[PDB]
Design a protein around this nucleic acid. Sequence first.
RNA 1: CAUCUCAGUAGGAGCGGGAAAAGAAAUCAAUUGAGAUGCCGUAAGUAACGGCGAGUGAAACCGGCACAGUUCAAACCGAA
RNA 2: UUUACUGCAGCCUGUCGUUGGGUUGUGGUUCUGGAUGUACAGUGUAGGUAGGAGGCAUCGAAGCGGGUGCGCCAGCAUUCGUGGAGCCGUCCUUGGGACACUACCCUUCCGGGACUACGACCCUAACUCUGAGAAGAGGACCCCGAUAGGUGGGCAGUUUG
Lengths: 115, 196
Amino acid sequence: KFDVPEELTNKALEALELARDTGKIKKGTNEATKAIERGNAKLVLIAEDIEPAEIVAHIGPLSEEKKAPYIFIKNQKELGAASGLGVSCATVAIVDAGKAAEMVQDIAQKLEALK
Amino acid sequence: MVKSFYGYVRDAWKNPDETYVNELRWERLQVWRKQGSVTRIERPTRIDRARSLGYKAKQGIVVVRVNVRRGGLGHVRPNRGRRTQKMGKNKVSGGMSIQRIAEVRADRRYPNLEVLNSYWVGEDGKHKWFEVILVDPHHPVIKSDKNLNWVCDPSSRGRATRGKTSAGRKGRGMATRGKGTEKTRPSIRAYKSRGK
RNA sequence: CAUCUCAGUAGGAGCGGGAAAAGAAAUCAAUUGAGAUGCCGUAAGUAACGGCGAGUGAAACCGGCACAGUUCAAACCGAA
RNA sequence: UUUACUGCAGCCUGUCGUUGGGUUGUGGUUCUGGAUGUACAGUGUAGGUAGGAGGCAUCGAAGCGGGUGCGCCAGCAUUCGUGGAGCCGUCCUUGGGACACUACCCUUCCGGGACUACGACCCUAACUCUGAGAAGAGGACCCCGAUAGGUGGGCAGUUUG
């Protein structure tokens, strides 16, 4: 996988903000895993700076099993901020896009291309 | 199915040498070898293992990695008169297991805390690595916590040194009931150490 | 006398309280039962071990003292 | 004290773990193109043992080149071609097996592709030594844990009526 474009990741962060505003976000690795397994996850954002890597190592293969678009964020502080949280967050799952559904599907198509 | 990510961590660590943990093990023992005997860590390596063993993300709960050598009881040949049975020591492994050795070294390193449990986190041809959870009975968070405030009692102090952890009870032979536990419960010393 | 016995004794190291440890069966039974743990009596110098020598040596059942049950990890919620 | 008995250290050596990646050499793992099968002669190659008989064909059946499977420069499959009828057998070529294009697992066939136990070589990336370090030298060896055998008055306990 080539490095996902910076503007595409920023679009992902903006979609996370908009899903905070209107839709539904499951912030936290356990919640995001539950959402992906249930098939409600429209978009998955996975932090890259996770120690240990076992915490979110399964998220990628799970989302590729269940056909959920997923993207990688540089580190977890701004991912938690985009999830509107005072702590870090290793992964979030947008399950209701609000008015960000079109941009979420744009990111999904772009990820499918870049794959 | 709707499984927690702790389940995935469990599956990943079920057969670690057949999963990505083997590669992670390769990079990770390099860092661990450079480290000393007892290292404090921010988060458990196996979060699901820690949580099932009693780890919580709260003040007064410390997690440490302990390095212990491999093999049996490195024993000295006696230099005085012995029976032939009591002369040989090379094949004499101990009665103290490596996990409990690691727990006791962690307890020695951290005098104010109490060992709760520990779990295997790695090993090589020379060393094994364990992660020991310790609790601060004098922290107000632990005092408030009604699932851990038993550790504030006078009898909960010195658990690892007196064999009161799960590994210690396994080494004492009280992991089972019924036949085979005739000389182990309620204590090894209670039957003149004839059990074990 | 070498396995054995002496004996996990003597001695050592660590921890530790007014008590400590154990403690609510992945148990004991046997045709179908009981129901946390500890301690005492008994089983019994029996079963078992053993140059099957010397010796070592239970437990369950049963009768008593005293009786006590519960908390997490996970599933569901998601900072409540 | 020792070539007394029985052991225990140390040391030598096999195996496992530590311990990875490549190149070839060794066994079959697994399967494509042929069922390749043939004392005696064959119109015809048992087209595996077979409904002991019964389907195809100028929209394909052969006598030929080093004969693409094979082999006794025969003959079955029609392919590079050009020559202008191979039947099944109740005339069974008086049968080691006697034979219909009918889901070929089977002594071959050498893409053996893929994992495997042993052995040889290389790489570094683990690991080791040196240095404060850059780095240099080794290197999956050595050390180390375990296990198996040897050697072993170095040491222990005894016996030597």
